[PDB]
């Protein structure tokens, strides 16, 4: 005597975008409600490792469009794009590479 | 259809629902505002 | 097997109605009518089937404008004085 | 639905031009004032019975008040 | 008779390349002004695998020489290419694995790959996995460079044609026995519709010269003339010799005395 359900929208195929959950209504009826698709979330660039970024939430389309900017970025430079270790690496790389270039140029000028 | 209802019967339609019948003709369910009485409008129309 | 059982495997349609001629000869996949070759500008017409030609020839329909213009030609394009 | 937090906000909600009615609901241990606005239904929950009576008489008589009751099928038919 | 299978494949149809899921053609960057005079330094961002190719592919990011943007070329990665490696391409590039240099700038005896047959063709020789070319000599009078191609043939090319230092990655692929028809099925899934293979003697004579007979046999010699028309040119086409090779494998292909 267990209840059996039917698709309530006009798509009757069990694809990844049409996943359903079983909901008991206040009228004591068992119905199928559509699961919203989820986003994987904001990641670092694929070539750098493709890891999720701390302080950034996983929002999909409309949710991302309506959410405040803080939910998707941090106050640090390149916030929402690069991680703290990546930002530190680029800062150190910037300073040290230019310093080495200056020393080489001054050496050639001295000669 | 809302504009035609205002022009022909001087009533305000708050909602129009339409369907194309299996015979091919379009049918409209026209709900009038609470200010207007549908029964009184039907009497004036002549369908009664 | 071929025959009765395979008759149940026939799903869908090869042809649907044609916008130009309405003969259910419009090949859905190739998007061209088998009867009138629509959307090619000219129709199909082959002398090996004169019967097909005379089914589709002028005068098999209403001749909506041809009747009017033929009367005008017969009356020498008469107009009021 | 939004829950009003204090009495000052509740009077502010009732002072809105778009607040068409106030539904007064009497629960066995609380009283709920539900203001029907344009977008949101605003509920003020008052646990004290005497305080609820004070608020009920305070409501500006311009806005219609509805005593929430159970309505039978017969009353709601046709 | 009917059309032979080898002729039918020429129509294309269902025998074409299964190009979906492929990343695109692999090539050197365009031989522009910077390459002809100086060098362009790029960074290897990813090493990727493409269906139907044994060799690994490298995505190399360059700055645009004229515009404020990046280029992101895609080349056949030599063995040893790694992410973060700096790739130098140009006349002034140093001799190191992964760099692209004009052939005239590369010392004789060096091992190269992604060799340009024509200057600016962006790499046409020594591209399959584990393959390489060897620089034999340079001739400055005519401005040509002699190479040993992977097949063993020697070929002369203009010295302005570029080459990549190293050998193509993924070598030794053909050393592992397949052991299963299913593995071949997956191997050819990314290439084309050419497997499994039916022997000509197993077919009927209507569709193949070797078909038919009350015994499975070719009743005529299988060495056919170079001038045989399609449909008749099956078997060992214009074979100079047949049978088990003994005492040394000669270099195959056409004979070029030059």
């Amino acid at each position: 005597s267990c209840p059996r359900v039917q698709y309530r929208r006009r798509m009757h195929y069990a694809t990844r975008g049409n996943r359903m959950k079983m909901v008991r209504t206040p009228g004591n009826k068992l119905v199928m409600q559509k699961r919203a698709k989820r986003s994987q979330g904001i990641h670092t660039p694929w070539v750098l490792g493709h890891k999720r970024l701390g302080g950034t939430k996983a929002l999909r389309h409309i949710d991302a469009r309506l959410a405040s900017r803080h939910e998707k970025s941090v106050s640090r430079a390149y916030g929402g794009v690069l991680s703290h270790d990546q930002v530190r690496d680029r800062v150190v790389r910037a300073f040290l590479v230019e310093e080495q270039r200056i020393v080489k140029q001054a050496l050639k000028e001295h000669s | 259809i809302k504009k035609a209802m205002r022009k022909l019967y001087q009533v305000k339609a708050v909602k129009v629902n339409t369907l194309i019948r299996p015979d091919g003709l379009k049918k409209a369910y026209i709900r009038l505002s609470a200010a207007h009485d549908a029964l009184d409008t039907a009497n004036k129309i002549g369908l009664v | 097997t071929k025959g009765t059982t395979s008759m149940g495997q026939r799903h869908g349609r090869t042809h649907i109605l044609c916008r130009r001629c309405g003969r259910n000869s419009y090949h859905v996949q190739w998007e061209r009518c088998a009867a009138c070759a629509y959307p090619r500008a000219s129709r199909r017409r082959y002398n090996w089937s004169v019967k097909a030609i005379k089914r589709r020839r002028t005068g098999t329909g209403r001749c909506r404008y041809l009747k009017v213009v033929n009367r005008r030609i017969a009356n020498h394009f008469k107009t009021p004085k | 639905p939004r829950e009003i937090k204090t009495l000052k906000e509740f009077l502010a909600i009732c002072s809105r031009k778009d607040a068409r009615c106030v539904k007064v609901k009497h629960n066995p241990s609380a009283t709920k004032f539900k203001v029907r606005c344009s977008r949101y239904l605003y509920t003020l929950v008052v646990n004290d019975k005497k305080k609820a009576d004070k608020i009920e008489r305070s409501i500006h008589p311009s806005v219609k008040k509805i005593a929430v009751t159970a309505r039978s099928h017969a009353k709601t038919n046709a | 008779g009917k059309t032979v299978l080898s002729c039918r494949k020429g129509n294309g149809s269902v025998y074409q390349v299964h190009g979906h899921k492929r990343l695109g053609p692999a090539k050197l960057r365009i031989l522009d002004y910077a390459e002809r005079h100086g060098y362009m330094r790029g960074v290897v961002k990813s090493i990727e695998h493409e269906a139907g190719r044994g060799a690994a592919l490298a995505r190399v990011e360059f700055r645009h020489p004229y515009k404020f943007r990046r280029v992101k070329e895609l080349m056949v990665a030599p063995e040893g290419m790694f992410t973060g490696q700096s790739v130098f391409c140009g006349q002034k590039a140093p001799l190191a694995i992964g760099n692209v240099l004009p052939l005239g700038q590369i010392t004789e005896g060096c091992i190269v790959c992604n060799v340009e047959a024509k200057p600016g063709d962006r790499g046409t020789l020594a591209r399959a996995s584990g393959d390489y070319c060897i620089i034999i000599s340079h001739n400055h009078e005519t401005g040509r460079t002699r190479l040993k191609l992977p097949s063993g043939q020697k070929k002369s090319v203009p010295s302005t044609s570029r080459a990549m230092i190293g050998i193509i990655s993924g070598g030794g692929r053909i050393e592992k026995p397949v052991l299963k028809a299913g593995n071949s099925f997956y191997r050819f899934r990314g290439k084309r519709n050419c497997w499994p293979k039916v022997r000509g003697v197993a077919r009927n004579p209507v569709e193949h010269p070797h078909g038919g007979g009350n015994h499975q046999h070719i009743g005529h010699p299988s060495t056919v003339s170079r001038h045989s028309p399609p449909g008749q040119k099956v078997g060992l086409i214009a074979a100079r010799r047949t049978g088990r090779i003994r005492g040394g494998k000669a270099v195959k292909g056409a004979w070029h005395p030059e």
Binding site: - | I20, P22, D23, G24 | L17, N24 | - | -
Partner: protein, 50 residues
Amino acid sequence: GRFKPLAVKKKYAKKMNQNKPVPYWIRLRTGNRIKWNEKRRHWRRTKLNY
């Protein structure tokens, strides 16, 4: 099923309208030759296939 172009639906609508018997007063006309509709259609006999 549920789906059909409006053009297909309109054609099916006209075929419904045509699927009617001959009016009785037609048979009483002076030079009448029609008794019953010779083009009556049943959904189980002949398929329109629109």
